Amino acid sequence: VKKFPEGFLWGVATASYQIEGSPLADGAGMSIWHTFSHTPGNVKNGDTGDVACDHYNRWKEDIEIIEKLGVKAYRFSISWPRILPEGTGRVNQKGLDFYNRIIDTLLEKGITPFVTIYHWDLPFALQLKGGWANREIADWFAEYSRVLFENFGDRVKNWITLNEPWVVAIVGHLYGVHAPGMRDIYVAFRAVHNLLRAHARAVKVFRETVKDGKIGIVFNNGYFEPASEKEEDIRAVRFMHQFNNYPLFLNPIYRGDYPELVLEFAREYLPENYKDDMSEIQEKIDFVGLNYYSGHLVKFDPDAPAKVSFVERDLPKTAMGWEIVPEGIYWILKKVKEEYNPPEVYITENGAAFDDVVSEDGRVHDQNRIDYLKAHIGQAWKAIQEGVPLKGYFVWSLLDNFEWAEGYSKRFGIVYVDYSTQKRIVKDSGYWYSNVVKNNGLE
């Protein structure tokens, strides 16, 4: 028996471009994911977000699902180009109306909204002006964030500025695998820095406009272990933690500079006078969100672009090929407390992709996903018993959805979506979780 604290927020999470469809409905502007996915070669099977789960139409049914499961919080994101179709300037009332209905409905039903301001769907109009590479995006983002705060901050009290800024910068602008699809290391590090500046401006505006709520930021994290007892493998782990995990961003926020090994690798790629922006970057935050999915074995490697390579292990893997390592969620939670001691932490995503099928009996028997979720929830509980101020846990995802460059080929939902009909079928993992939430823990 593992009972969580009284009032612990059990949640589910989604993102706008992944679930909504109808990207150009009701006067919305194009996003960078619209243009990226519509470019041949960028997304598996030529898939796009044009339809997705059709949540733009089916949002009431989906929230009724969350309500029927008894889940207490819903993390969702707002599409910037539905709100400001050119990124700045004109506000689109029909976009505000879409999200107003969702927010009013969740509150009617007693579900706490957690709003992600940016989950990767930058307005295309801003990408034409350099997007995250342009210092002026700190102003654009702050203006966007102020619109949201002024329209929704009377009702929404839990806000997240950025989802996984490492991904946005590095996968988007170095690896070129995500929108906007660039491969330039100097751009990617300018994006890292502008992401921090934009985050901080939005937190500054939040303090002026929503006197009652809390604001934070979300990071991707892996559990890196060293391949050997060699000092060089241990240091490769230190580097991957500092670069790929929360320290890239929390070292600036809490300490006023990038982590040491990131500076060793990337000083030449940051702006020349980047320290001039650090005092502003330290704007106080209310909580940290940590996403966690996987662990990696890591070794020093002289021929790799950052002197690190991954070493495959014969461990159970998900359909993404990602190693299942539940102790990682404990470790990152312990480690964030030890390194930065944030006042609150949330697991804002944890989940798994498996090759789900609808059985003859009408059900989806995803015991593999139950097992994954139960183990990570247990490790989260552990960290709570050892003093980490974990206030909530959000499953990625409510719904099978558009998995970015993998398209529809990877199902992370606790609810199966049959894309030919848009039918929703609650998976065994969804039923299992509803019981966890009702009991406030595991048994």
Ligand X SMILES: OC[C@H]1c2[nH]cnc2[C@H](O)[C@@H](O)[C@@H]1O
Options 225, 323, 349, 403, the catalytic residue: 349
**Least CB distance to a copy of itself at residue 339 (A):** 29
Q: How far apart are CA 240 and CA 229, in angstroms?
A: 16
- Residues 6 or more apart from 291 whose CB is under 8 A from it? 164, 218, 219, 220, 221, 347, 348, 349, 350, 396
Nearer to Cl ion, 134 or 409 (CB): 134
Residue 258: contacted member of Cl ion, Na ion, ligand X, none (CB under 5 to 8 Å, by partner type):
none
Nearer to Na ion, 280 or 339 (CB): 280
Q: How far apart are CA 96 and CA 369, in angstroms?
A: 35
**Segment 172 to 191, residues that bind a copy of itself, using CB under 8 A:** 174, 176, 179-187, 190
Going by C-alpha positions, the residue among 375, 381, 361, 347 that lies closest to residue 428 is 361
**Segment 270 to 329, residues that bind Na ion, using CB under 5 A:** 276, 279
Residue at shortest CB range from Cl ion = 135
Nearer to a copy of itself, 208 or 276 (CB): 276
Residue 374: contacted member of Cl ion, a copy of itself, Na ion, none (CB under 5 to 8 Å, by partner type):
none
Residue 349 is a catalytic residue: yes
**Is the alpha carbon torsion for 419, 424, 428, 432 positive or negative?**
positive
Residues in the chain: 443
381 binds ligand X (CB under 6 A): no
Q: How far apart are CA 435 and CA 401, in angstroms?
A: 24
**Cα angle value 388/384/246 (rounded, 5°):** 40
Q: For a copy of itself, which stretch binds (CB under 8 A), given 120-128, 156-164, 252-260, 427-435?
A: 120-128
Q: How far apart are CA 299 and CA 311, in angstroms?
A: 7
**Segment 106 to 135, residues that bind Cl ion, using CB under 5 A:** 128, 134-135
The region, left, alpha or beta by phi > 0 then psi within -120 to 50, assigned to residue 362 is: left
349 binds ligand X (CB under 6 A): yes
Residue 231 is a catalytic residue: no
**Least CB distance to Na ion at residue 278 (A):** 7
User: CB count, 10 Å around CB of 234?
Assistant: 16
- Cα separations in angstroms, 344 against 204, 208, 259, 296: 19, 21, 22, 26
Give me the 215-244 binding string for ligand X, x by CB under 6 A, dash otherwise: -----x------------------------
**Least CB distance to Cl ion at residue 43 (A):** 25
> Are the C-beta atoms of residues 130 and 78 closer than 8 Å to each other?
no
**Least CB distance to a copy of itself at residue 254 (A):** 27
**Least CB distance to a copy of itself at residue 60 (A):** 32
Q: How far apart are CA 210 and CA 197, in angstroms?
A: 20
Options 20, 164, 225, 403, the catalytic residue: 164
The residue ranges that bind a copy of itself (CB under 8 A) are: 30, 32, 35-36, 38-42, 124, 127-131, 133-136, 174, 176, 179-187, 190, 305
The residue ranges that bind ligand X (CB under 6 A) are: 15, 18, 163-164, 220, 291, 293, 349, 396, 403, 412
Which residues are known to be catalytic? 164, 349
